[PDB]
Structure 1
Amino acid sequence: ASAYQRFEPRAYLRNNYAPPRGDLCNPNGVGPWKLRCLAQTFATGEVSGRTLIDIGSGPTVYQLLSACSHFEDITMTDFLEVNRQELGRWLQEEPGAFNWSMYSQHACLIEGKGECWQDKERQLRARVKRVLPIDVHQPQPLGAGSPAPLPADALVSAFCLEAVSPDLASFQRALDHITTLLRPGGHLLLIGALEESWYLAGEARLTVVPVSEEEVREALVRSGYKVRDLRTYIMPAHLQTGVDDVKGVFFAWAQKV
Protein backbone atom coordinates (compact mmCIF):
# COMPACT_ATOMS: atom_id res chain seq x y z
CA ALA A 1 0.00 0.00 0.00
CA SER A 2 3.08 2.23 0.40
CA ALA A 3 2.46 3.04 -3.27
CA TYR A 4 -0.06 5.70 -2.25
CA GLN A 5 2.82 7.50 -0.60
CA ARG A 6 4.15 8.65 -4.00
CA PHE A 7 0.63 9.50 -5.22
CA GLU A 8 0.71 12.98 -6.83
CA PRO A 9 -2.69 14.80 -6.56
CA ARG A 10 -2.07 17.21 -9.46
CA ALA A 11 -0.99 14.39 -11.80
CA TYR A 12 -4.06 12.40 -10.82
CA LEU A 13 -6.36 15.37 -11.57
CA ARG A 14 -4.48 15.96 -14.80
CA ASN A 15 -4.65 12.30 -15.88
CA ASN A 16 -8.32 11.99 -15.03
CA TYR A 17 -10.22 15.28 -15.01
CA ALA A 18 -8.43 17.44 -17.58
CA PRO A 19 -8.98 16.89 -21.33
CA PRO A 20 -9.59 14.49 -23.01
CA ARG A 21 -11.37 12.68 -20.11
CA GLY A 22 -12.18 16.11 -18.73
CA ASP A 23 -13.78 17.43 -21.92
CA LEU A 24 -17.41 17.72 -20.90
CA CYS A 25 -18.68 19.13 -24.22
CA ASN A 26 -19.19 15.65 -25.72
CA PRO A 27 -22.23 13.89 -24.21
CA ASN A 28 -20.69 10.51 -25.04
CA GLY A 29 -17.67 11.03 -22.80
CA VAL A 30 -16.95 9.60 -19.33
CA GLY A 31 -17.11 12.95 -17.54
CA PRO A 32 -20.71 13.68 -18.60
CA TRP A 33 -21.60 10.04 -17.86
CA LYS A 34 -20.41 10.20 -14.23
CA LEU A 35 -22.28 13.49 -13.62
CA ARG A 36 -25.39 12.08 -15.29
CA CYS A 37 -25.56 9.00 -13.04
CA LEU A 38 -25.13 11.23 -10.00
CA ALA A 39 -27.78 13.77 -11.09
CA GLN A 40 -30.39 11.24 -12.21
CA THR A 41 -30.16 9.38 -8.89
CA PHE A 42 -30.71 12.47 -6.72
CA ALA A 43 -33.49 13.81 -8.96
CA THR A 44 -35.56 10.81 -7.92
CA GLY A 45 -36.03 12.38 -4.49
CA GLU A 46 -35.31 9.01 -2.83
CA VAL A 47 -31.77 9.73 -1.59
CA SER A 48 -32.36 12.18 1.22
CA GLY A 49 -31.48 13.14 4.78
CA ARG A 50 -29.27 15.50 6.77
CA THR A 51 -25.71 14.13 6.75
CA LEU A 52 -23.62 12.59 3.98
CA ILE A 53 -20.10 11.16 3.87
CA ASP A 54 -17.85 10.88 0.81
CA ILE A 55 -15.40 7.97 1.03
CA GLY A 56 -11.96 8.33 -0.53
CA SER A 57 -12.58 11.78 -1.98
CA GLY A 58 -9.01 12.19 -3.16
CA PRO A 59 -8.58 15.69 -4.59
CA THR A 60 -11.93 15.72 -6.41
CA VAL A 61 -15.29 17.36 -5.59
CA TYR A 62 -17.39 16.56 -8.70
CA GLN A 63 -18.88 13.53 -6.98
CA LEU A 64 -20.87 15.81 -4.66
CA LEU A 65 -22.10 18.52 -7.06
CA SER A 66 -25.59 17.06 -7.36
CA ALA A 67 -25.48 15.72 -3.81
CA CYS A 68 -24.85 18.99 -1.99
CA SER A 69 -28.38 20.23 -2.60
CA HIS A 70 -29.86 17.26 -0.74
CA PHE A 71 -27.59 17.18 2.33
CA GLU A 72 -26.85 20.07 4.66
CA ASP A 73 -23.96 18.35 6.43
CA ILE A 74 -21.31 16.86 4.18
CA THR A 75 -18.13 15.10 5.26
CA MET A 76 -15.25 14.57 2.83
CA THR A 77 -12.43 12.12 3.43
CA ASP A 78 -9.16 10.66 2.20
CA PHE A 79 -6.26 8.50 3.32
CA LEU A 80 -3.70 11.04 2.06
CA GLU A 81 -3.05 14.41 3.65
CA VAL A 82 -1.84 15.89 0.35
CA ASN A 83 -5.30 15.10 -1.04
CA ARG A 84 -6.98 16.67 1.98
CA GLN A 85 -4.73 19.69 1.51
CA GLU A 86 -5.65 19.85 -2.15
CA LEU A 87 -9.34 19.76 -1.19
CA GLY A 88 -8.87 22.62 1.25
CA ARG A 89 -7.43 24.75 -1.51
CA TRP A 90 -10.74 24.42 -3.37
CA LEU A 91 -13.15 24.60 -0.45
CA GLN A 92 -11.34 27.76 0.71
CA GLU A 93 -10.72 29.33 -2.70
CA GLU A 94 -7.00 29.33 -1.80
CA PRO A 95 -4.45 30.00 -4.59
CA GLY A 96 -3.64 27.34 -7.19
CA ALA A 97 -6.73 25.30 -6.40
CA PHE A 98 -8.09 22.99 -9.08
CA ASN A 99 -10.63 24.47 -11.50
CA TRP A 100 -13.86 22.48 -11.19
CA SER A 101 -16.07 25.07 -12.88
CA MET A 102 -16.63 23.13 -16.13
CA TYR A 103 -18.12 20.41 -13.89
CA SER A 104 -20.28 22.77 -11.81
CA GLN A 105 -21.59 24.15 -15.07
CA HIS A 106 -22.38 20.69 -16.45
CA ALA A 107 -24.04 19.55 -13.25
CA CYS A 108 -26.23 22.68 -13.49
CA LEU A 109 -26.87 21.90 -17.17
CA ILE A 110 -27.83 18.28 -16.45
CA GLU A 111 -29.93 19.02 -13.36
CA GLY A 112 -31.93 21.55 -15.36
CA LYS A 113 -33.19 23.75 -12.52
CA GLY A 114 -31.79 26.90 -14.11
CA GLU A 115 -29.14 27.19 -11.38
CA CYS A 116 -26.01 29.25 -12.00
CA TRP A 117 -22.81 27.27 -11.45
CA GLN A 118 -21.58 29.78 -8.84
CA ASP A 119 -24.57 29.06 -6.62
CA LYS A 120 -23.86 25.36 -6.98
CA GLU A 121 -20.25 25.76 -5.85
CA ARG A 122 -21.30 28.14 -3.09
CA GLN A 123 -23.71 25.57 -1.66
CA LEU A 124 -21.16 22.73 -1.93
CA ARG A 125 -18.41 24.70 -0.17
CA ALA A 126 -20.98 25.75 2.42
CA ARG A 127 -22.19 22.24 3.20
CA VAL A 128 -18.81 20.46 3.32
CA LYS A 129 -18.24 20.89 7.05
CA ARG A 130 -15.10 18.82 7.39
CA VAL A 131 -12.29 16.98 5.62
CA LEU A 132 -11.28 13.90 7.66
CA PRO A 133 -8.62 11.18 7.41
CA ILE A 134 -9.95 7.71 6.64
CA ASP A 135 -8.69 4.15 6.10
CA VAL A 136 -11.22 1.74 4.68
CA HIS A 137 -9.10 -1.28 5.61
CA GLN A 138 -9.94 -0.49 9.25
CA PRO A 139 -13.13 -1.94 10.82
CA GLN A 140 -13.82 1.63 11.94
CA PRO A 141 -12.69 3.50 8.77
CA LEU A 142 -12.99 6.94 10.38
CA GLY A 143 -11.53 5.97 13.73
CA ALA A 144 -13.22 6.01 17.12
CA GLY A 145 -13.92 9.61 18.12
CA SER A 146 -14.81 11.01 14.70
CA PRO A 147 -16.35 14.50 14.42
CA ALA A 148 -18.47 13.20 11.52
CA PRO A 149 -22.15 12.78 12.51
CA LEU A 150 -22.76 9.01 12.64
CA PRO A 151 -24.44 7.18 11.22
CA ALA A 152 -24.72 9.01 7.90
CA ASP A 153 -28.02 9.15 6.05
CA ALA A 154 -26.07 8.45 2.85
CA LEU A 155 -22.64 7.55 1.46
CA VAL A 156 -20.83 8.40 -1.76
CA SER A 157 -17.58 6.78 -2.90
CA ALA A 158 -15.88 7.04 -6.27
CA PHE A 159 -12.93 5.00 -7.52
CA CYS A 160 -11.71 4.33 -3.99
CA LEU A 161 -12.36 0.71 -2.93
CA GLU A 162 -11.18 -1.15 -6.04
CA ALA A 163 -8.17 1.18 -6.17
CA VAL A 164 -7.03 0.46 -2.58
CA SER A 165 -7.67 -3.30 -2.55
CA PRO A 166 -5.23 -6.09 -3.55
CA ASP A 167 -8.06 -8.45 -4.46
CA LEU A 168 -11.73 -9.33 -4.41
CA ALA A 169 -11.90 -10.27 -0.73
CA SER A 170 -10.16 -7.15 0.49
CA PHE A 171 -12.63 -5.21 -1.68
CA GLN A 172 -15.46 -7.09 0.03
CA ARG A 173 -14.19 -6.31 3.53
CA ALA A 174 -13.67 -2.60 2.80
CA LEU A 175 -17.28 -2.45 1.58
CA ASP A 176 -18.24 -4.09 4.88
CA HIS A 177 -16.17 -1.49 6.73
CA ILE A 178 -17.66 1.61 5.12
CA THR A 179 -21.14 0.10 5.30
CA THR A 180 -20.97 0.32 9.11
CA LEU A 181 -20.89 4.13 8.81
CA LEU A 182 -24.17 3.94 6.86
CA ARG A 183 -27.42 4.11 8.82
CA PRO A 184 -29.92 1.29 8.13
CA GLY A 185 -32.27 2.17 5.28
CA GLY A 186 -29.48 4.53 4.24
CA HIS A 187 -28.23 5.02 0.68
CA LEU A 188 -24.87 4.37 -0.98
CA LEU A 189 -23.74 5.72 -4.36
CA LEU A 190 -20.76 3.66 -5.40
CA ILE A 191 -18.81 4.56 -8.54
CA GLY A 192 -15.66 2.87 -9.80
CA ALA A 193 -13.56 1.38 -12.56
CA LEU A 194 -14.37 -1.95 -14.23
CA GLU A 195 -11.66 -4.52 -14.93
CA GLU A 196 -8.86 -2.06 -14.05
CA SER A 197 -5.50 -3.32 -12.77
CA TRP A 198 -3.26 -0.24 -12.54
CA TYR A 199 -3.24 3.52 -12.93
CA LEU A 200 -0.58 6.21 -12.63
CA ALA A 201 -0.39 9.29 -10.41
CA GLY A 202 2.86 11.01 -11.34
CA GLU A 203 5.69 8.93 -9.89
CA ALA A 204 3.26 6.48 -8.33
CA ARG A 205 1.97 3.32 -9.95
CA LEU A 206 -1.08 2.05 -8.08
CA THR A 207 -2.37 -1.50 -8.15
CA VAL A 208 -6.09 -1.97 -8.68
CA VAL A 209 -8.32 -5.04 -8.29
CA PRO A 210 -10.05 -5.85 -11.58
CA VAL A 211 -13.75 -6.13 -10.78
CA SER A 212 -16.73 -6.85 -13.02
CA GLU A 213 -20.31 -5.64 -12.78
CA GLU A 214 -21.60 -8.98 -11.43
CA GLU A 215 -18.80 -8.97 -8.86
CA VAL A 216 -19.79 -5.43 -7.80
CA ARG A 217 -23.43 -6.49 -7.61
CA GLU A 218 -22.71 -9.56 -5.49
CA ALA A 219 -20.43 -7.68 -3.10
CA LEU A 220 -23.13 -5.10 -2.40
CA VAL A 221 -25.46 -7.96 -1.68
CA ARG A 222 -23.08 -9.77 0.68
CA SER A 223 -22.68 -6.42 2.45
CA GLY A 224 -26.39 -6.16 3.19
CA TYR A 225 -27.41 -3.88 0.34
CA LYS A 226 -30.42 -3.98 -1.93
CA VAL A 227 -29.22 -2.93 -5.40
CA ARG A 228 -31.67 -0.31 -6.70
CA ASP A 229 -29.56 0.42 -9.77
CA LEU A 230 -26.36 -0.71 -11.44
CA ARG A 231 -25.21 0.72 -14.79
CA THR A 232 -22.11 0.44 -16.95
CA TYR A 233 -20.16 2.80 -19.18
CA ILE A 234 -17.70 1.26 -21.65
CA MET A 235 -14.47 3.26 -21.99
CA PRO A 236 -14.18 4.38 -25.61
CA ALA A 237 -10.79 4.00 -27.32
CA HIS A 238 -10.13 7.74 -27.47
CA LEU A 239 -10.28 7.92 -23.66
CA GLN A 240 -7.84 5.07 -23.18
CA THR A 241 -4.89 7.38 -22.77
CA GLY A 242 -1.99 5.47 -21.26
CA VAL A 243 -2.69 6.67 -17.70
CA ASP A 244 -4.34 3.36 -16.82
CA ASP A 245 -6.14 0.33 -18.17
CA VAL A 246 -9.72 0.86 -17.04
CA LYS A 247 -12.09 -0.93 -19.43
CA GLY A 248 -15.31 0.64 -18.21
CA VAL A 249 -17.01 2.41 -15.33
CA PHE A 250 -19.82 1.09 -13.16
CA PHE A 251 -22.35 3.08 -11.16
CA ALA A 252 -24.27 1.52 -8.29
CA TRP A 253 -27.19 2.92 -6.33
CA ALA A 254 -27.63 0.67 -3.31
CA GLN A 255 -29.74 0.79 -0.14
CA LYS A 256 -28.74 -0.75 3.20
CA VAL A 257 -31.55 -3.12 4.18
Structure 2
Amino acid sequence: VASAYQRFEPRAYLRNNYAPPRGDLCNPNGVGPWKLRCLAQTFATGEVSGRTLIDIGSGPTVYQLLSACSHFEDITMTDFLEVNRQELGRWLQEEPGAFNWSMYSQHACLIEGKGECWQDKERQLRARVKRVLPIDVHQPQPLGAGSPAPLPADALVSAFCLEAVSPDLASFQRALDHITTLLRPGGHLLLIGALEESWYLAGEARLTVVPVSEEEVREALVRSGYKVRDLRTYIMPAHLQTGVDDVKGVFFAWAQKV
Protein backbone atom coordinates (compact mmCIF):
# COMPACT_ATOMS: atom_id res chain seq x y z
CA VAL A 1 0.00 0.00 0.00
CA ALA A 2 2.49 2.62 1.23
CA SER A 3 4.38 1.78 -1.96
CA ALA A 4 1.35 2.23 -4.21
CA TYR A 5 0.45 5.64 -2.79
CA GLN A 6 3.85 6.89 -3.90
CA ARG A 7 2.36 7.47 -7.34
CA PHE A 8 -0.81 9.06 -5.94
CA GLU A 9 -1.58 12.21 -7.97
CA PRO A 10 -3.75 14.68 -5.99
CA ARG A 11 -4.84 16.62 -9.07
CA ALA A 12 -6.03 13.45 -10.81
CA TYR A 13 -7.73 12.30 -7.60
CA LEU A 14 -9.61 15.58 -7.15
CA ARG A 15 -10.60 15.49 -10.82
CA ASN A 16 -11.82 11.89 -10.57
CA ASN A 17 -14.01 12.35 -7.52
CA TYR A 18 -14.72 16.03 -7.02
CA ALA A 19 -15.14 17.37 -10.54
CA PRO A 20 -18.15 16.69 -12.79
CA PRO A 21 -20.05 14.38 -12.90
CA ARG A 22 -19.52 13.44 -9.24
CA GLY A 23 -18.43 17.01 -8.65
CA ASP A 24 -21.62 18.39 -10.18
CA LEU A 25 -23.64 19.17 -7.06
CA CYS A 26 -26.71 20.46 -8.90
CA ASN A 27 -28.40 17.05 -8.85
CA PRO A 28 -29.62 16.31 -5.30
CA ASN A 29 -29.34 12.59 -6.04
CA GLY A 30 -25.56 12.67 -6.37
CA VAL A 31 -22.91 11.31 -4.02
CA GLY A 32 -21.63 14.78 -3.16
CA PRO A 33 -24.94 16.24 -1.96
CA TRP A 34 -25.47 13.00 -0.03
CA LYS A 35 -22.17 13.17 1.82
CA LEU A 36 -22.63 16.88 2.65
CA ARG A 37 -26.18 16.18 3.80
CA CYS A 38 -25.05 13.38 6.15
CA LEU A 39 -22.35 15.59 7.67
CA ALA A 40 -24.69 18.59 7.95
CA GLN A 41 -27.56 16.71 9.59
CA THR A 42 -25.27 15.11 12.16
CA PHE A 43 -23.70 18.34 13.38
CA ALA A 44 -27.11 20.03 13.24
CA THR A 45 -28.24 17.76 16.09
CA GLY A 46 -25.87 19.69 18.32
CA GLU A 47 -24.76 16.40 19.90
CA VAL A 48 -21.29 16.51 18.34
CA SER A 49 -19.35 19.38 19.88
CA GLY A 50 -16.14 20.31 21.67
CA ARG A 51 -12.92 22.26 21.16
CA THR A 52 -10.62 20.08 19.04
CA LEU A 53 -11.21 17.92 15.97
CA ILE A 54 -8.92 15.69 13.93
CA ASP A 55 -9.54 14.74 10.31
CA ILE A 56 -7.89 11.38 9.58
CA GLY A 57 -6.49 10.94 6.08
CA SER A 58 -7.66 14.27 4.68
CA GLY A 59 -5.84 13.78 1.42
CA PRO A 60 -6.24 16.88 -0.76
CA THR A 61 -9.88 17.56 0.17
CA VAL A 62 -11.74 19.82 2.61
CA TYR A 63 -15.43 19.10 1.87
CA GLN A 64 -15.56 16.70 4.80
CA LEU A 65 -15.03 19.62 7.21
CA LEU A 66 -17.43 22.27 5.82
CA SER A 67 -20.24 21.68 8.34
CA ALA A 68 -17.84 20.58 11.07
CA CYS A 69 -15.75 23.75 11.23
CA SER A 70 -18.51 25.71 12.99
CA HIS A 71 -18.48 23.33 15.98
CA PHE A 72 -14.76 23.07 16.69
CA GLU A 73 -12.29 25.94 17.08
CA ASP A 74 -9.18 23.76 16.81
CA ILE A 75 -9.09 21.57 13.71
CA THR A 76 -6.24 19.26 12.72
CA MET A 77 -6.02 17.98 9.16
CA THR A 78 -3.75 15.06 8.32
CA ASP A 79 -2.36 12.76 5.64
CA PHE A 80 0.30 10.22 4.74
CA LEU A 81 1.56 11.98 1.63
CA GLU A 82 3.54 15.21 1.54
CA VAL A 83 2.02 16.04 -1.87
CA ASN A 84 -1.45 16.01 -0.33
CA ARG A 85 -0.49 18.11 2.69
CA GLN A 86 0.95 20.51 0.10
CA GLU A 87 -2.27 20.63 -1.93
CA LEU A 88 -4.18 21.29 1.30
CA GLY A 89 -1.82 24.12 2.15
CA ARG A 90 -2.46 25.75 -1.21
CA TRP A 91 -6.16 25.97 -0.40
CA LEU A 92 -5.73 26.97 3.24
CA GLN A 93 -3.34 29.75 2.20
CA GLU A 94 -5.34 30.68 -0.90
CA GLU A 95 -2.15 30.23 -2.92
CA PRO A 96 -1.91 29.92 -6.72
CA GLY A 97 -3.49 26.82 -8.22
CA ALA A 98 -5.52 25.85 -5.16
CA PHE A 99 -8.40 23.52 -5.98
CA ASN A 100 -11.79 25.23 -6.20
CA TRP A 101 -14.08 23.93 -3.42
CA SER A 102 -16.57 26.76 -3.82
CA MET A 103 -19.40 24.56 -5.18
CA TYR A 104 -19.16 22.31 -2.11
CA SER A 105 -18.94 25.32 0.24
CA GLN A 106 -22.03 26.82 -1.41
CA HIS A 107 -24.00 23.59 -1.11
CA ALA A 108 -22.99 23.03 2.50
CA CYS A 109 -24.35 26.53 3.19
CA LEU A 110 -27.47 25.66 1.21
CA ILE A 111 -27.95 22.39 3.11
CA GLU A 112 -27.25 23.93 6.51
CA GLY A 113 -29.94 26.53 5.84
CA LYS A 114 -28.51 29.27 8.05
CA GLY A 115 -28.29 31.71 5.14
CA GLU A 116 -24.50 31.86 5.45
CA CYS A 117 -22.52 33.00 2.41
CA TRP A 118 -19.96 30.47 1.19
CA GLN A 119 -17.03 32.88 1.61
CA ASP A 120 -17.74 33.15 5.33
CA LYS A 121 -17.90 29.36 5.56
CA GLU A 122 -14.53 28.94 3.81
CA ARG A 123 -13.11 31.75 5.96
CA GLN A 124 -14.09 29.95 9.15
CA LEU A 125 -12.64 26.67 7.89
CA ARG A 126 -9.30 28.22 6.96
CA ALA A 127 -9.19 30.00 10.33
CA ARG A 128 -9.96 26.97 12.49
CA VAL A 129 -7.53 24.66 10.69
CA LYS A 130 -4.47 25.12 12.86
CA ARG A 131 -2.25 22.43 11.37
CA VAL A 132 -1.84 19.81 8.64
CA LEU A 133 0.07 16.85 10.05
CA PRO A 134 1.58 13.69 8.57
CA ILE A 135 -0.08 10.49 9.72
CA ASP A 136 -0.01 6.71 9.43
CA VAL A 137 -3.06 4.81 10.64
CA HIS A 138 -1.04 1.59 10.66
CA GLN A 139 1.16 2.77 13.55
CA PRO A 140 -0.25 2.19 17.07
CA GLN A 141 0.19 5.96 17.46
CA PRO A 142 -0.90 7.45 14.07
CA LEU A 143 0.45 10.94 14.80
CA GLY A 144 3.50 9.62 16.58
CA ALA A 145 4.68 10.83 19.97
CA GLY A 146 4.55 14.52 20.81
CA SER A 147 2.51 15.88 17.90
CA PRO A 148 1.19 19.48 17.97
CA ALA A 149 -2.31 18.00 17.79
CA PRO A 150 -4.27 18.33 21.07
CA LEU A 151 -5.06 14.88 22.44
CA PRO A 152 -7.33 13.26 23.11
CA ALA A 153 -9.40 14.93 20.40
CA ASP A 154 -13.06 15.81 20.96
CA ALA A 155 -14.09 14.51 17.56
CA LEU A 156 -12.70 12.56 14.64
CA VAL A 157 -13.64 12.76 10.98
CA SER A 158 -12.32 10.42 8.31
CA ALA A 159 -13.45 9.89 4.75
CA PHE A 160 -12.24 7.21 2.35
CA CYS A 161 -9.09 6.43 4.27
CA LEU A 162 -9.13 3.24 6.30
CA GLU A 163 -10.62 0.91 3.69
CA ALA A 164 -8.39 2.54 1.08
CA VAL A 165 -5.19 1.77 2.99
CA SER A 166 -5.85 -1.68 4.48
CA PRO A 167 -5.34 -4.92 2.47
CA ASP A 168 -8.20 -6.69 4.26
CA LEU A 169 -10.74 -6.52 7.07
CA ALA A 170 -8.20 -7.33 9.80
CA SER A 171 -5.91 -4.46 8.81
CA PHE A 172 -9.05 -2.30 8.64
CA GLN A 173 -9.92 -3.18 12.25
CA ARG A 174 -6.45 -2.46 13.62
CA ALA A 175 -6.21 0.87 11.80
CA LEU A 176 -9.57 1.72 13.35
CA ASP A 177 -8.27 0.89 16.84
CA HIS A 178 -5.16 2.93 16.07
CA ILE A 179 -7.05 6.15 15.32
CA THR A 180 -9.61 5.52 18.06
CA THR A 181 -6.82 5.97 20.61
CA LEU A 182 -6.88 9.61 19.44
CA LEU A 183 -10.54 9.95 20.36
CA ARG A 184 -11.48 11.12 23.84
CA PRO A 185 -13.86 8.81 25.74
CA GLY A 186 -17.43 9.80 24.93
CA GLY A 187 -16.10 11.43 21.78
CA HIS A 188 -17.59 11.20 18.30
CA LEU A 189 -16.39 9.66 15.05
CA LEU A 190 -17.89 10.58 11.67
CA LEU A 191 -16.67 7.94 9.23
CA ILE A 192 -17.40 7.96 5.49
CA GLY A 193 -16.13 5.25 3.15
CA ALA A 194 -16.54 3.11 0.05
CA LEU A 195 -18.78 0.04 0.15
CA GLU A 196 -17.80 -3.11 -1.73
CA GLU A 197 -15.03 -1.33 -3.67
CA SER A 198 -11.69 -2.93 -4.55
CA TRP A 199 -9.70 -0.32 -6.45
CA TYR A 200 -9.72 3.31 -7.53
CA LEU A 201 -7.32 5.37 -9.64
CA ALA A 202 -5.36 8.50 -8.79
CA GLY A 203 -3.29 9.30 -11.86
CA GLU A 204 -0.52 6.77 -12.44
CA ALA A 205 -1.47 5.20 -9.09
CA ARG A 206 -3.79 2.19 -8.88
CA LEU A 207 -4.97 1.70 -5.30
CA THR A 208 -6.29 -1.49 -3.78
CA VAL A 209 -9.33 -1.25 -1.54
CA VAL A 210 -10.74 -3.73 0.94
CA PRO A 211 -14.34 -4.52 -0.10
CA VAL A 212 -16.44 -3.90 3.00
CA SER A 213 -20.15 -4.13 3.70
CA GLU A 214 -22.44 -2.14 6.00
CA GLU A 215 -22.50 -5.00 8.54
CA GLU A 216 -18.73 -5.37 8.43
CA VAL A 217 -18.42 -1.64 9.13
CA ARG A 218 -20.92 -1.76 11.99
CA GLU A 219 -19.24 -4.78 13.59
CA ALA A 220 -15.78 -3.21 13.26
CA LEU A 221 -17.02 -0.02 14.93
CA VAL A 222 -18.55 -1.99 17.81
CA ARG A 223 -15.38 -4.07 18.20
CA SER A 224 -13.45 -0.83 18.56
CA GLY A 225 -15.74 0.10 21.43
CA TYR A 226 -18.08 2.49 19.64
CA LYS A 227 -21.80 2.96 20.04
CA VAL A 228 -23.22 3.21 16.52
CA ARG A 229 -25.50 6.24 16.59
CA ASP A 230 -26.16 6.27 12.83
CA LEU A 231 -25.06 4.26 9.77
CA ARG A 232 -26.31 5.07 6.25
CA THR A 233 -25.78 3.67 2.80
CA TYR A 234 -25.78 5.44 -0.55
CA ILE A 235 -26.00 3.28 -3.66
CA MET A 236 -23.80 4.54 -6.47
CA PRO A 237 -26.07 5.40 -9.44
CA ALA A 238 -25.01 4.27 -12.92
CA HIS A 239 -24.36 7.87 -14.01
CA LEU A 240 -21.71 8.25 -11.31
CA GLN A 241 -19.99 4.97 -12.23
CA THR A 242 -17.23 6.33 -14.45
CA GLY A 243 -14.22 4.00 -14.64
CA VAL A 244 -12.05 5.63 -11.96
CA ASP A 245 -13.07 2.83 -9.62
CA ASP A 246 -15.60 0.07 -9.01
CA VAL A 247 -17.29 1.46 -5.90
CA LYS A 248 -20.78 0.02 -5.36
CA GLY A 249 -21.94 2.28 -2.56
CA VAL A 250 -20.88 4.76 0.11
CA PHE A 251 -21.40 4.53 3.84
CA PHE A 252 -21.74 7.15 6.54
CA ALA A 253 -21.30 6.28 10.19
CA TRP A 254 -21.74 8.42 13.30
CA ALA A 255 -20.24 6.50 16.19
CA GLN A 256 -19.69 7.52 19.80
CA LYS A 257 -16.82 6.12 21.86
CA VAL A 258 -18.17 4.41 24.98
Same-fold call, TM cutoff 0.5: yes
Q: What's the CA shift string for 1:153-210, capped at 9, x where partnerless?
A: 0000000000000000000000000000000000000000000000000000000000
Q: What's the CA shift string for 1:108-151, capped at 9, x where partnerless?
A: 00000000000000000000000000000000000001000000
Q: What's the CA shift string for 1:31-87, capped at 9, x where partnerless?
A: 100000000000000000000000000000000000000000000000000000000
Look up the SS of the partner of 1:36 in the other structure.
Answer: helix
1:100 Cα deviation from its structure 2 partner: 0.1
Look up the SS of the partner of 1:190 in the other structure.
Answer: strand
Rounded to whole Å, the distance in 2 between the matches of 1:27 and 1:161 is 27
- Is 1:88 the counterpart of 2:71 in the alignment? no
Rounded to whole Å, the distance in 1 between the matches of 2:211 and 2:22 is 20
1:18 Cα deviation from its structure 2 partner: 0.1
Rounded to whole Å, the distance in 1 between the matches of 2:165 and 2:216 is 16
Look up the SS of the partner of 1:171 in the other structure.
Answer: helix
What is the root-mean-square deviation of aligned Cα atoms in Å?
0.3
Rounded to whole Å, the distance in 1 between the matches of 2:191 and 2:179 is 11
Matched ranges for 1:103-182 at <5 A:
103-182=104-183
Rounded to whole Å, the distance in 2 between the matches of 1:62 and 1:113 is 18
Aligned to 1:222: 223
1:228 Cα deviation from its structure 2 partner: 0.2
Rounded to whole Å, the distance in 2 between the matches of 1:142 and 1:210 is 26
Rounded to whole Å, the distance in 1 between the matches of 2:28 and 2:208 is 30
Rounded to whole Å, the distance in 1 between the matches of 2:23 and 2:104 is 9
1:22 Cα deviation from its structure 2 partner: 0.4
1:90 Cα deviation from its structure 2 partner: 0.1
1:221 Cα deviation from its structure 2 partner: 0.2
Look up the SS of the partner of 1:21 in the other structure.
Answer: coil
- Is 1:13 the counterpart of 2:26 in the alignment? no
Aligned to 2:241: 240
1:23 Cα deviation from its structure 2 partner: 0.5
Rounded to whole Å, the distance in 2 between the matches of 1:156 and 1:76 is 9
Rounded to whole Å, the distance in 1 between the matches of 2:246 and 2:138 is 24
Rounded to whole Å, the distance in 1 between the matches of 2:229 and 2:7 is 37
1:250 Cα deviation from its structure 2 partner: 0.3
Rounded to whole Å, the distance in 2 between the matches of 1:153 and 1:201 is 32
Aligned to 1:71: 72
Aligned to 2:42: 41
Q: Runs of 5+ in structure 2 lacking a partner?
A: none
Q: Runs of 5+ in structure 1 lacking a partner?
A: none
Look up the SS of the partner of 1:118 in the other structure.
Answer: helix
Rounded to whole Å, the distance in 2 between the matches of 1:14 and 1:165 is 23
Q: How many residues were matched structurally?
A: 257
Rounded to whole Å, the distance in 1 between the matches of 2:237 and 2:164 is 21
Rounded to whole Å, the distance in 1 between the matches of 2:92 and 2:130 is 10
Rounded to whole Å, the distance in 2 between the matches of 1:34 and 1:17 is 12
% of aligned pairs identical?
100
Rounded to whole Å, the distance in 1 between the matches of 2:176 and 2:255 is 12
